[PDB]
Ligand binder design. Structure first.
Ligand SMILES: CC(C)N(C)S(=O)(=O)N1CCO[C@H](C)C1
Length: 166
């Protein structure tokens, strides 16, 4: 069946106050079927709150929209982010990699989530031995958001624990 609706949503910040449900939909329908699309407004004045959300039919459509950033909607570059599972970071902790996992193992796996800028395999300050964890820094937060919602990460045969790093 369908992926959970929460994983199909994009929170769009930085909207022009002139953006409407209809203009937000017309824009974001370029990357998939929208089952929902709302501009948040004040309950009394109806003036835009400057943000809204869109819900796609599939996760692949969310990916397509994110890959099409930057989005200029009604003349203003907006800020789409996947729904919270927002702590917006570009770096992950990767644990459980033991002593045999190398840079290329992490690169070959994680490069399919986003563009990697730094891989830091952690070693012991005294002995230089690998400590069994690493940090990966990407050029953009959506890579991290995609990573941390997965139930599982398998790298170099290890089932890894992956979390946002700050
Ligand atoms: C040993 C490991 C489990 N940590 C406690 S960490 O390496 O300090 N680490 C640094 C902060 O970001 C990560 C989420 C956590």
């Amino acid at each position: 069946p369908k992926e959970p609706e929460q994983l199909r949503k994009l929170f769009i910040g930085g909207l022009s106050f002139e953006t409407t449900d209809e203009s937000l939909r017309s824009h974001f329908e370029q990357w998939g079927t929208l089952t929902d699309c709302v501009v948040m407004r004040d309950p009394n004045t109806k003036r835009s709150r400057g943000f809204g959300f869109v819900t796609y039919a599939t996760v692949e459509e969310v990916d397509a929209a994110m890959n099409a950033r930057p989005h200029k909607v009604d003349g203003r570059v907006v800020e789409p982010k996947r729904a919270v599972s927002h702590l917006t970071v570009k770096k992950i902790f990767v644990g459980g990699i033991k002593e045999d996992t190398e840079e290329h193992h992490l690169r070959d796996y994680f490069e399919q989530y986003g563009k990697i800028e730094v891989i830091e395999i952690m070693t012991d300050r005294g002995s230089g031995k690998k400590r069994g964890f690493a940090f990966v820094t990407f050029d953009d937060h959506d890579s991290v958001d995609k990573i941390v919602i997965q139930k599982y990460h398998t790298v170099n045969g290890h089932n890894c624990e992956v979390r946002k790093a700050l």
